[PDB]
Every structure is written in structure tokens, then in C-alpha cells.
Design a protein around this ligand. Structure first.
Ligand SMILES: Nc1ncnc2c1ncn2[C@@H]1O[C@H](COP(=O)(O)OP(=O)(O)O)[C@@H](O)[C@H]1O
Ligand SMILES: Nc1ncnc2c1ncn2[C@@H]1O[C@H](COP(=O)(O)OP(=O)(O)O)[C@@H](O)[C@H]1O
Ligand code: BEF
Ligand SMILES: [Mg+2]
Ligand SMILES: [Zn+2]
Ligand SMILES: [Zn+2]
Lengths: 411, 98, 208, 245
């Protein structure tokens, strides 16, 4: 089997798909049960009617994934269903190859569980797991559309790359030199989608009734109507009376998901009996906790403090080279005006002789990471980088995760 | 304060141009002024500029095509130090003329 | 206008320390025993860092049922004992075999497995790894990870030198008004407008 | 709205390229010889070679002499300096009428200059004397100058200043963490305010909080500022004013 399977393991959503297809198959990674006791599958969460009382139980914790039974059952559902996903099917998978993605700071024992489950259970011939930051130097192997933003302005892989990957779990800043991550300068940002979602449930619980019981509705509002301040919090706060968005709640008898209504847009003249929630301050208050954590009362340092500390641990020759090549991946970078704000606030702290450039791809960045992650398999270095099955059967189970797939060898 | 608006954009200082010399007999003599204004040189900053113009031109003529270009200075270990050297000595080239 | 002559005492007056001051009113006295004993036995303070971590992890959690189980894990991550920092700081299962049979009924509609097993030691390890039912705290309590591994994974990734680079912004706690920066009386909470105070006196004022 | 006081209906002489004046053009009716001859005077000022030429306009009231004077003043344009003056205004008791007359002859001429100036700005970090810690005998090291470390956004640089501009720095009551504006060639000092990093130090403060200035520390630009030669004569005559005693 020549084309392998590209599976990106995440906390919110696991993106799987073959190497031939251009776009991955989106499937969630959770197990939701209702208050009545009915348990639904992860892809069937969007099909149910009532989103009021939903208990979310997922095998992925904040650090890593601990339970491989529910995650392995999700893998059996996504890989073993030909009728659920159009065109995709797999009979056994003994000759197929797998490209997986794990965390950079994962535990070694859970990685032994991963290599034993994937290697022994699924009978893969060769597998190469690596974090998402290592696939980022392989962007230049193929020609693609990627927007470049200059902060100062008003083989095929490259050595110097700076990877800032925001996620649902947390945000990681991983510097990459010679295609290898430098783990002494990696910084962790604890701000993620759970803090924006829970913070929006707290602010909406103070301005209105407590929406903490419903997480999918606040997740949809946070995905739809949220935007980052382009200039500052003060200029966006003086324009909070002109810029406002009105969200109508989805009534369970009529509509499963709500709709965002703009007061400038007269395209929705249909009246309804439901009430509308006004959103003025929470539009720009929620994404401002990355740069300024004083608004959310947390003692976190901030994103650019971890960027400057991440550049502080690097050698002085590699400091002005990594700031010229910055690629941003993840779902939190899909918010508008976040790249120019991050490049501007990063430009206001860097020295004059160094010029900062931030390259953010068009569209969703997680699908971009799956696309370049699929373009890594087409590279000829993957044939030398892959580990055979008989080599794993010869060596111990701890050697393959400790030496080649481990961060401790690169330290 | 309404007439302390931005004047220094459209104002000359007129004290730097040696035109308030009606106050120059307070602390300057005649032979101090002739002996002080006989002695103002060009051709020494021209010497320090010309001794650095050789080091500017040997890097500009050889590596000046891809040195200052942002495409080659994006990811390079040897070219970026030559770029910062050239942009470092251009400021020292114009500064001595200033 | 300004008086050029000012009468002043020698002992009472100091030029530096200047002080001016003026149904039933009664000063607020806390009847709590741990508050009085806590007062008599005593850049951000460490207890406020613990409050920010506890509020950050309570705001990090998704479900109501997972709220009391989180400060045990946060107390495992910090290193301080659980019962002391849980008693001093006030804040603000997953797997079942029958449920796994319900997921087997969920994906039972379309599947293509091939079952083939042989008794080996790696298959006993497969049955141990596949059926785990262990929390992340149980993995942190295990001796399989090194102490330097836990220090590098948890304590070394956070930034040490740079605490604050960007300018700090204080806003109102109700609507975030920066045009009126006015900290309250009993709590010292920043309140901008009049409706923010009238909504502040009822719910968000604990020290009143 | 629009104020009209016996003028503003004339937008110049309104002559053709051949020279022949129209009957109805540019707020003028009739008067061909004074308008076309006045345009010959307009080209005579556009020659930039002639001097000493005196052309009087003689006529009765309501005939258009001052209107022709606004016609040549509007036909010349804003780039050519125009000095309106009345002969009754030349009488002075401070100086003679000779000095006001020849002074007005120095007021008519203009001279445009171009010059570059250096712009420094940033947040004040340290105000401290220099050491260079060998004593050399010459000093228990200082004569009181101050190194001003201006922290800008895109750069951090330290600069040494004169005691006069340091005296104006003491006049502006700045401290550690205040955004200032300092000009190199002139020496003038303007304070913008306290930086935004110290806004959370006190809840209420009379000093406004301004953001950090974007860009480098050292900036340069060129101006095409015009300044009359009489303004250079007053600049050569008497001291105007400074920030020192
Ligand atoms: N268009 C969007 N607007 C705002 N937020 C988005 C958008 N798309 C995705 N997100 C956020 O990104 C998160 C998904 O990130 P994901 O790529 O799943 O991270 P991980 O790699 O940790 O699984 C979601 O929680 C969602 O809140
Ligand atoms: N040819 C003309 N076209 C238009 N307006 C004229 C003309 N001649 C005279 N006037 C008008 O007559 C008014 C008075 O003439 P003025 O030039 O003041 O006379 P004098 O120069 O003798 O004082 C002016 O406001 C002007 O508008
Ligand atoms: F694990 Be995800 F990338 F936050
Ligand atoms: Mg990810
Ligand atoms: Zn408010
Ligand atoms: Zn209060």
C-alpha cells in the first residue's frame, strides 16, 4: 500500500483521512450523554435535538490522553465505517501505513501505550508519529496559497522555522531548527478554547441567565460572532456602541442552531417570538485575554512574554532568523485580525535591526496542517524516517518511543 | 496651547545656522573666530568614509545581489550576517556625513 | 485665596503626614473565627496566585460534575497538599462497560473487523493497556516517569524570567469602562458607571 | 457660511494664452487694457529677473484698482509672496519710516529652503550621570551631564545630552517611565505623558496615559518649508525666545 493514512489526534476534533484526498474527514473526539441517559456517538452529537443538558466525557485530558479504550473505539468508528464517510473504507490495514500526531511534552508511558496499541492491535506495517511543528518546515516542498504579514510594514524543507500552535487544549510555541524542535525554548500557554468558552459562559452568566449548562451553544456563539480587536482595547471599546452583534437563541421546537444578526443588515426581516441577546463587550473582551490577561483576572504572563522568553533561550545567531519565518496553525488563529494584532504587538517589542514576518495560511489552519502533514508522506525523507514492523518487534517497546519518537533524545 | 500646535515641522531653528551672531561678541573674540573658522575640514570624514567604502563595495559587488534581498535573508546562516554588516555600515557611512 | 499665614502645632502637626476627616449606623465587623485568628496570626501575593489558578481551573473545566474533582488534580500539579489549599481557597464517571456496549451498538451498524488472537505476553500487555480505567493523577502517582521527566514536562516549560512585558490594563468589572477607573469601598473593585454600582451592590459585593 | 466683503468674485485676471482678454471672464466686465497689461505684470513677476520696476495704478473711485490688485495677487498664486500695505501705515514712532519702508522691501521677497532634522522619542528609563569608572584625576567622575535612556517600541537606545536640554527635562517634571519628545538640532522638549505600562499604578491621576510611540528611536525627514527673507532678518536682529533663563 503506497498512500498512507494521515490521522491528526486532537482534544476537540480528530482529523483523519487518506493521503490521496485533499481535505480530511472531520470527526469529533468526545462521548456525550444526555440527562435522560441516552449516549450518542461523537459524529452524532450534531444530529440530536436538545442541546440543553449534555455531559461531555472525553478520553483526552488536559495533559495527554489516558484511556485508549474509548479513543481506540473512536478510531474503530472512524476507520472501520465505509458508509459513514464517502469513498473511505478499510478492510484490515495490514499493509497500510499511518502518520500520527501527538503532543511534544507527552508522557513516555502513554506513548508506550500508543505504540503498543497502534503497532500490535491495528497491525500497521510502518508508522511515524511526530508533533505538528515538525511538519511545518515541509511547507516549502509544495506550492500553496499562504498570506504573509509583515509586522514592521505599516532539500525541500527549511531549517529555521518558528511554530506557534494554538489549540483547544492549550497553545504551544515550538521553535524548530534544522527540522528538529528545540525543547529547551518551548513555552506553554495555558489559554485555550476551554478558557474562552468557560469565560464566555461566566460573562454571559453574569450579564444574563447562567449559560454554563450549555456548552455547544456558547461554543457556536464563540465560533461565529467573536473577533479580535485590530488596534487596541480602548479604540474597540469606544466603538462598542457602533459595532454590536445580536444573537437570537435557537428554540428547540423550531431551530437547532441559532443565527447571527447584524443591525446594519436588513436581510432578515422575519419576526420570531424568541428573545435576542445583545453582545457588545464580549465580542472583543474574550480574545483580548491572550495579550492582556488582566481583563480576565488571571495571573498568566501572556503570549508575547512566552514568545520573548522563547527567543531568550535560543542562541543569538538563531534569534533574528526564526522571527522572519513564523507559521501559525490551529483553530484559534481562525479568528479575524488576530495575525496582524499578534504581528504588531510582537513588532512593538522586537529590536529595530530585526524584521518580523508572520505567514498565516488561507482558510482553516488545522486543514492546512493536515495538508502539509499529508505532503510529508510524499517526501523522500519519509522513506528513511519510517520505522518498520520487524524493527519494532526486535527492539523493546520503550526503545521506539524513547529514542526516535521521544523528546528526551533531542534534549 | 492652541498656538503651541506643531510648528517644528514647518519651522527652522535659525540658531544653528550661525545667524544669531549679534550675540557672538559676548564670548568670542576676533582672532578666536578667524582662527576658529579658518579651521573647518572636509576631507577627513571623506577619508573615514572612503576607507569604509572599500569594505562596503567588496560585499556589495560580490554578495550585494542577494545580501539585502529579503528572499535570501529569510533563512540563511551566512548571508544574514553579511546583510546586517552592510546595513550596519550604511548607517556609519551616512552618520559621518551628518 | 491662598493664605500666606498658617497656624500650626509643634507636636501634633507634621508637614509630611497630612490627614483630614470629619437607622442605626454600625461598622462592619466580621464574626468569623478563622478571619480573626487569621488576622492575629499573620509581584502578586502567593495566595492570589493560588486563587487565580483555582479560578483558572474552575473556568477551564467543561462540566458541572467535573468541578470538584479538578482542584485535586491542580493540587497535584502545584505540589502543595490538597486538603489545606482546598480548605483555604473556595472555588468560584467517564467509562462504563454498559455504555461501551451502547457505543458497540452505535458503531455496530457498519464495521469490517477480522478477529485473530494468540496467547502471548505482548497480548497480555495488550489486554492490560487496552483496559486501563486510570486517571491522569494515577499516572502522575506512578513511578514509571522520572522526577526529572516531571520537572521538564511540567515545571520547565513555563517562562521564568519574563513575567510582564506588555502594558497592564485595568478596566471595570461590570462592562469594562476605562474612562471611569473607580475602585470600590468594601472590596476595592473597579466600577465605572452608576448602573454598574447599582448592579454591583447586590450580587458581586461579598465584603459588604 | 461664505463671507463676501467687496471681493471673492474675482478668481484672477482670466486671460487667454494668446493674451487677448475676454469681455466677461473671472468676475471682470470690460477693462481690457488694465487686465491684459496686468497680466504682463504677472509674467514680469514670473520672470524672477526684474527688480526696481514700479507701476502705479491711477484712476477714480469704483473703477477697479484694488480689485485689479486682488486680481494680480490671485493670479500670482500662493507660491509667490504678496505683501498688502497701505501708505498710511508706514508712519512709526519707534523707528523711522525709512526702516519700515526698506524693511517692507525686504518683506516682499521670499526664499524657500530644504533641511533635514533628527527626531528622538521614547520612554525615559534612567536619568543618571556618567562614570567610565577610571577617575583619571580629572573628576570624582562627573561634570553634571545626564544620559537619557529612551525606550521606544522597536528599539532601546541611550543618549547623552547638554545641561540646557537636561534643564528643560527638569522643567517638564518627567520621571522614570514618561514618554518625552526630544529634537536633536533644536533642543526643544515636549512631554507626551506617562506610558501605558504605569496606568495601573494609581486609580486616578491627572497625568494622561499615552501609548508607546511606534517606529525607531532615531527618525529623519525633509521639509520644503518656505520662510520669508524678512523673517530671517528678524531672526538675525533680536532674540525671539527660548526655554532657558
Ligand atoms: N472559524 C472559527 N472561529 C472561531 N473559533 C474556531 C473556528 N474554527 C475553530 N475554532 C476553534 O478551534 C478549536 C478547534 O481546534 P483544533 O484544531 O480542534 O485543536 P486541537 O489540535 O487541540 O484538536 C475549537 O474549539 C474552536 O473553538
Ligand atoms: N471691472 C470690474 N469688474 C468687477 N468689479 C469691479 C470692476 N471695477 C470695479 N469693481 C468693483 O468696484 C468696487 C470698488 O472699486 P475699488 O477697486 O475699491 O476702487 P478704488 O481702487 O478707487 O478704491 C470693488 O469692490 C470692485 O468689486
Ligand atoms: F490538542 Be490540540 F492541538 F489543542
Ligand atoms: Mg493539534
Ligand atoms: Zn462598568
Ligand atoms: Zn463593593
Amino acid at each position: 500500500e503506497t498512500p498512507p493514512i494521515v490521522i491528526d489526534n486532537g482534544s476537540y476534533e480528530i482529523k483523519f483521512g487518506p493521503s490521496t484526498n485533499k481535505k480530511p474527514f472531520r470527526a469529533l473526539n468526545a462521548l456525550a450523554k444526555d440527562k435522560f441517559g441516552t449516549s450518542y456517538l461523537s459524529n452524532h452529537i450534531k444530529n440530536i435535538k436538545d442541546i440543553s443538558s449534555i455531559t461531555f466525557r472525553r478520553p483526552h485530558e488536559l495533559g495527554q490522553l489516558t484511556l485508549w479504550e474509548l479513543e481506540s473505539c473512536i478510531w474503530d468508528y472512524c476507520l472501520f465505517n465505509p458508509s459513514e464517510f464517502d469513498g473511505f473504507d478499510l478492510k484490515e490495514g495490514k499493509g497500510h501505513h499511518l502518520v500520527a500526531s501527538e503532543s511534544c511534552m507527552t508522557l513516555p508511558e502513554l506513548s508506550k501505550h500508543a505504540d503498543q496499541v497502534i503497532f500490535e492491535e491495528y497491525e500497521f506495517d510502518s508508522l511515524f508519529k511526530s508533533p505538528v511543528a515538525v511538519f511545518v518546515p515541509f511547507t516549502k516542498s509544495y506550492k500553496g496559497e499562504m498570506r504573509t504579514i509583515s509586522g514592521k510594514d505599516e532539500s525541500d524543507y527549511h531549517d529555521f522555522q518558528l511554530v506557534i500552535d494554538s489549540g483547544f487544549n492549550c497553545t504551544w510555541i515550538i521553535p524548530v531548527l534544522k527540522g528538529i524542535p528545540y525543547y529547551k525554548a518551548v513555552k506553554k500557554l495555558d489559554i485555550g478554547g476551554r478558557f474562552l468558552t468557560g469565560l464566555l459562559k461566566e460573562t454571559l452568566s453574569f450579564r444574563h441567565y447562567n449559560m454554563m449548562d450549555e456548552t455547544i451553544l456558547v461554543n457556536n456563539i464563540k465560533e461565529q460572532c467573536l473577533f479580535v480587536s485590530p488596534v487596541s482595547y480602548f479604540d474597540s471599546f469606544k466603538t462598542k456602541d457602533k459595532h454590536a452583534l445580536e444573537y437570537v437563541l435557537p428554540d428547540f421546537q423550531t431551530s437547532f442552531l441559532g443565527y447571527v444578526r447584524n443591525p446594519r443588515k436588513e436581510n432578515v426581516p422575519l419576526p420570531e417570538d424568541a428573545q435576542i441577546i445583545t453582545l457588545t463587550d464580549e465580542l472583543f473582551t474574550i480574545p483580548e485575554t491572550f495579550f492582556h490577561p488582566e481583563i480576565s483576572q488571571i495571573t498568566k504572563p501572556g503570549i508575547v512574554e512566552a514568545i520573548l522568553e522563547s527567543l531568550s533561550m535560543l542562541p543569538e545567531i538563531v534569534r533574528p532568523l526564526m522571527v522572519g519565518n513564523i507559521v501559525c496553525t490551529g483553530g484559534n488563529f481562525n479568528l479575524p485580525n488576530f495575525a496582524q494584532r499578534l504581528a504588531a504587538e510582537l513588532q512593538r517589542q522586537l529590536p529595530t535591526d530585526w524584521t518580523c514576518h508572520v505567514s498565516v495560511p488561507e482558510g482553516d489552519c488545522a486543514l492546512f496542517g493536515w495538508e502539509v502533514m499529508s505532503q510529508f508522506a510524499k517526501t523522500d525523507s519519509y522513506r528513511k524516517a519510517r520505522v518498520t514492523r520487524e524493527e519494532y518487534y526486535e527492539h523493546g517497546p520503550d526503545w521506539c518511543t524513547k529514542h526516535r519518537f521521544g523528546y528526551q533524545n533531542w534534549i | 496651547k492652541l498656538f503651541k500646535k506643531n510648528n517644528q515641522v514647518n519651522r527652522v531653528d535659525l540658531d544653528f545656522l550661525n545667524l544669531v551672531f549679534t550675540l557672538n561678541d559676548k564670548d568670542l573674540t576676533s582672532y578666536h573666530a578667524e582662527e576658529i573658522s579658518k579651521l573647518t575640514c572636509v576631507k577627513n570624514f571623506v577619508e573615514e568614509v572612503n576607507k569604509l567604502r572599500e569594505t562596503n563595495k567588496q560585499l556589495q559587488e560580490e554578495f550585494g545581489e542577494a545580501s539585502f534581498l529579503n528572499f535570501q535573508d529569510a533563512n540563511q546562516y551566512f548571508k544574514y550576517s553579511n546583510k546586517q554588516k552592510l546595513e550596519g555600515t550604511v548607517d556609519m557611512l551616512n552618520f559621518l556625513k551628518m | 485665596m491662598k493664605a500666606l499665614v498658617e497656624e500650626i502645632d509643634k507636636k501634633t502637626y507634621n508637614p509630611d503626614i497630612y490627614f483630614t476627616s470629619l437607622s442605626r449606623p454600625v461598622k462592619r465587623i466580621n464574626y468569623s473565627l478563622a478571619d480573626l485568628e487569621a488576622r492575629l496570626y499573620t509581584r502578586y501575593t502567593q495566595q492570589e496566585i493560588l486563587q487565580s489558578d483555582r479560578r483558572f481551573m474552575e473556568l477551564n473545566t467543561e462540566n458541572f460534575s467535573d468541578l470538584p474533582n479538578v482542584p485535586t488534580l491542580l493540587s497535584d500539579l502545584t505540589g502543595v497538599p490538597r486538603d489545606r489549599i482546598e480548605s483555604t481557597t473556595k472555588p468560584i464517571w467517564v467509562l462504563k462497560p454498559e455504555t461501551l456496549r451502547e457505543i458497540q451498538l452505535s458503531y455496530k451498524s457498519t464495521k469490517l473487523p477480522k478477529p485473530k488472537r494468540k496467547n502471548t505476553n505482548r497480548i497480555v500487555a495488550l489486554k492490560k493497556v487496552l483496559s486501563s480505567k486510570r486517571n491522569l493523577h494515577s499516572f502522575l502517582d506512578s513511578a514509571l516517569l522520572n522526577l526529572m521527566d516531571k520537572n521538564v514536562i511540567y515545571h520547565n516549560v513555563y517562562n521564568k524570567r519574563y513575567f510582564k512585558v506588555l502594558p497592564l490594563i485595568t478596566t471595570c468589572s461590570i462592562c469594562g469602562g476605562y474612562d471611569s477607573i473607580s475602585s470600590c469601598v468594601n472590596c476595592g473593585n473597579k466600577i465605572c458607571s452608576v448602573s454598574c454600582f447599582k448592579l454591583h451592590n447586590e450580587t458581586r459585593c461579598r465584603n459588604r | 457660511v461664505t463671507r463676501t466683503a467687496a471681493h471673492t468674485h474675482i478668481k484672477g485676471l482670466g486671460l487667454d494664452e494668446s493674451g487677448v482678454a475676454k469681455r466677461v471672464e473671472g468676475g471682470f466686465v470690460g477693462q481690457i487694457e488694465a487686465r491684459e497689461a496686468c497680466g504682463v505684470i504677472v509674467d514680469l513677476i514670473k520672470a524672477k529677473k526684474m527688480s526696481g520696476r514700479a507701476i502705479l495704478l491711477a484712476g477714480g473711485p469704483s473703477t477697479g484698482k484694488t480689485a485689479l490688485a486682488l486680481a494680480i495677487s490671485q493670479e500670482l498664486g500662493p507660491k509667490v509672496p504678496f505683501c498688502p500695505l497701505v501708505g498710511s501705515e508706514l508712519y512709526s514712532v519707534e523707528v523711522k519710516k525709512t526702516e519700515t519702508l526698506m524693511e517692507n522691501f525686504r518683506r516682499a521677497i521670499g526664499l524657500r529652503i530644504k533641511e533635514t532634522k533628527e527626531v528622538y522619542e521614547g520612554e525615559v528609563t534612567e536619568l543618571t550621570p556618567e562614570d567610565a569608572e577610571n577617575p583619571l584625576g580629572g573628576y570624582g567622575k562627573t561634570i553634571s551631564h545626564v544620559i537619557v535612556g529612551l525606550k521606544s517600541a522597536k528599539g532601546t537606545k541611550t543618549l547623552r545630552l547638554d545641561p540646557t536640554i537636561y534643564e528643560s527635562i527638569q522643567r517638564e517634571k518627567v520621571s522614570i517611565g514618561d514618554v518625552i519628545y526630544i529634537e536633536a538640532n533644536t533642543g526643544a522638549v515636549k512631554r507626551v505623558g506617562r506610558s501605558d505600562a504605569y496606568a495601573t499604578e494609581f486609580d486616578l491621576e491627572t497625568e494622561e496615559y499615552v501609548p508607546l510611540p511606534k517606529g525607531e528611536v532615531h527618525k529623519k525627514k525633509e521639509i520644503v518649508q518656505d520662510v520669508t527673507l524678512h523673517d530671517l532678518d528678524v531672526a538675525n536682529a533680536r532674540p525671539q525666545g527660548g526655554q532657558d533663563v
